[PDB]
Structure 1
Amino acid sequence: MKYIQTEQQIEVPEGVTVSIKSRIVKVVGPRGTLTKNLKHIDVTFTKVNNQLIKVAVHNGGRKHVAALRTVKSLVDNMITGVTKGYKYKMRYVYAHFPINVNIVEKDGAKFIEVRNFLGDKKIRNVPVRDGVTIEFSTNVKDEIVLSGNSVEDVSQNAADLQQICRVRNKDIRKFLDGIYVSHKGFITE
């Protein structure tokens, strides 16, 4: 069954301005600007008014129509990111060896450096993606906080960090050491 018409609504809030042309979406808000190429999907965007964009699929199968609500979310997340922003919190976990995290520079680059992970002499390095901002909370012990407009950049940068601290040749039910995401949320709440 091909559905004649499926349609999602994207609610644009007051401060933000969505430009779309040949499926290249630019969102511009208080916190800054995000773009996103969507030329990999056949959808049609339409402006109802200044506060509402519709996105529609015509004559689409089940798989095509599944993409449509994805498109809504990706554009909605662009808008959330450039008003409310994104902030992921990660805790360190360790039995014995204190994980020792800090920001460095390797040719004006920026890198989350992880020392002493399970007492390892290896120094782990994780690039900080452009537009992500790291900070170590004071109130909470052993907490790193990644933050940015782009949830895809923020969230991936946290995953990069979670994954660098995987435990090898040990039973990971026992050896629970790592840097895990504890809280996904916004900057302004």
Structure 2
Amino acid sequence: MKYIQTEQQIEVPEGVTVSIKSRIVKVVGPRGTLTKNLKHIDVTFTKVNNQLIKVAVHNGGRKHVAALRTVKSLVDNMITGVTKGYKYKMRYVYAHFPINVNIVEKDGAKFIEVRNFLGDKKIRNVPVRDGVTIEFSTNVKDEIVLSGNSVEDVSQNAADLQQICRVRNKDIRKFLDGIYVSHKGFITEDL
């Protein structure tokens, strides 16, 4: 029905800074720098009082209005990722075969290899995306920790681990094997 004016606000905290060049959002904070290309959405940014940013859509349809809210969420995810960080935690579950995962290095890429998954002799390799820091957890049995700034790079690298250890030609309800997300949190403490 072509909503004349729909608008969402973006709250920017103390330490970080946001710079936009005609759609190119650059969020720079204590943990680093994040850049995103949003040139496929066609929204309008405006700075109000150096602590709040407003995004406006003029004469947009229902689908185009639905693309307004995802703009604010993507920028907020970029903002919270450079102050609080993003920390994904997984657990290894197996019935008989202990899954062995180690950090390897070929051609300077820091792959993640998986061994002894359901007794398979094949070594599945998972490449670590840039910005994601992989660390093995302490005092918890079979836990891996994925940490980084970009939520869409930590979770996608996380999704690669979850989808590489699939079970085929068996009953999924019985063979409870895989690398599953346990908790999606933040890197910084107290929050």
TM interval, shorter chain, is over 0.9
Shift of 1:46: 0.5
SS at match of 1:179: strand
CA offsets 1:105-142 (integer angstroms, 9 cap, x no match): 01111011000000100001000000000011111110
Cα RMSD for the two superposed structures:
0.5
For 1:181 and 1:112, how far apart are their aligned partners in 2?
16
Q: Structure 1: 5+ residue runs without aligned partners? A: none
CA offsets 1:31-73 (integer angstroms, 9 cap, x no match): 0000000000110000011110000100011000000000000
Q: Structure 2: 5+ residue runs without aligned partners? A: none
SS at match of 2:103: strand
SS at match of 2:48: strand
CA offsets 1:67-125 (integer angstroms, 9 cap, x no match): 00000000000000010000000100000000101110011110110000001000010
For 2:11 and 2:134, how far apart are their aligned partners in 1?
30
Misfit runs of 4+, over 6 Å:
none
SS at match of 1:101: strand
Corresponding residue number in structure 2 for 1:167: 167
Corresponding residue number in structure 1 for 2:32: 32
For 1:76 and 1:141, how far apart are their aligned partners in 2?
33
Instruction: Give the structure-2-normalised TM-score.
Output: 0.98
For 1:139 and 1:45, how far apart are their aligned partners in 2?
46
For 2:49 and 2:69, how far apart are their aligned partners in 1?
20
For 1:21 and 1:108, how far apart are their aligned partners in 2?
34
Instruction: Give the structure-1-normalised TM-score.
Output: 0.99
Corresponding residue number in structure 1 for 2:83: 83
For 1:62 and 1:139, how far apart are their aligned partners in 2?
50
Shift of 1:15: 0.2
The answer on 1:47 being equivalent to 2:47 is yes
Shift of 1:176: 0.9
SS at match of 1:135: strand
